[PDB]
Amino acid sequence: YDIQAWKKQCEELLNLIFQCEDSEPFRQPVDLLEYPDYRDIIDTPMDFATVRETLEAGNYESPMELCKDVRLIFSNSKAYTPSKRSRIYSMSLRLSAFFEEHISSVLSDYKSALRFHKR
Numbered sequence: 001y002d003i004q005a006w007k008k009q010c011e012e013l014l015n016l017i018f019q020c021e022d023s024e025p026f027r028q029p030v031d032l033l034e035y036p037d038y039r040d041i042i043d044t045p046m047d048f049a050t051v052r053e054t055l056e057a058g059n060y061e062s063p064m065e066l067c068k069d070v071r072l073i074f075s076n077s078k079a080y081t082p083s084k085r086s087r088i089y090s091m092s093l094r095l096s097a098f099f100e101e102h103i104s105s106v107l108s109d110y111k112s113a114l115r116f117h118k119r
């Protein structure tokens with residue numbers, strides 16, 4: 001019932017994500033010189049270094065907020081891909097499945113801890 005445990009669990013999950021070769025296109029803010037029309041399609045860019053930095057700054061109040069930003073990395077990739085078979089989009093699909101598999105217990109434990117706190 002540890003209400004704060006999610007933070008270190010998210011730090012460790014981000015470490016696993018950075019070790020994954022599939023995260024390489026998503027580790028840093030997108031390259032506007034390589035994709036000059038990116039901001040025409042994507043309103044809110046997001047990347048894993050920004051998520052990690054926001055976590056480390058103490059600027060997430062809950063793992064649900066972190067999860068919303070990570071899911072935005074994947075929906076941006078889906079919105080920008082010219083094809084559902086593209087290399088970078090295929091990497092985002094695998095990485096999304098890995099992330100969802102690991103974040104589920106983090107969210108469940110946090111929500112359970114908050115319910116216990118307010119019992």
Ligand SMILES: NC(=O)N1CCN(c2ccc(F)cc2)CC1
Pocket residue numbers: 025026028029030031032034035076077078080081082083086087088089
């Ligand atoms: N690191 C970068 O400069 N990019 C910007 C474009 N983005 C993307 C997503 C799907 C796709 F199929 C093609 C490109 C991923 C991250």
